[PDB]
């Protein structure tokens, strides 16, 4: 998301970790819309917990299934 927003992906990632550690524990993400600072929590942008949890479960289940196929058998055409 930082590469699509015109920001340094490494610099922003390291910045988000410093704001959530030395300052205080909170949720501060990459800015999808133009703004002048961090802490999108003020903008009241929320995502469903069941929606985000469903993504990490399907991504983990898919990654395990990919590792369970070590061979690709593709038959020819008649």
């Amino acid at each position: 998301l930082a590469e699509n927003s015109g920001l340094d992906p490494i610099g922003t990632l390291s910045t988000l970790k410093s704001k959530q550690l030395k300052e205080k524990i909170s949720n501060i993400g990459v800015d999808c819309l133009g703004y002048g600072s961090n802490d999108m929590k003020e903008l009241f942008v929320v995502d469903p917990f069941i929606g985000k949890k469903q993504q990490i479960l399907l991504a983990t289940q898919l990654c395990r299934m990919i590792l369970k196929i070590d061979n690709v058998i593709i038959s020819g055409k008649d």
Partner: peptide
Amino acid sequence: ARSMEGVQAF
């Protein structure tokens, strides 16, 4: 590494 910031932290 968390004490640094920016590209140098990575």
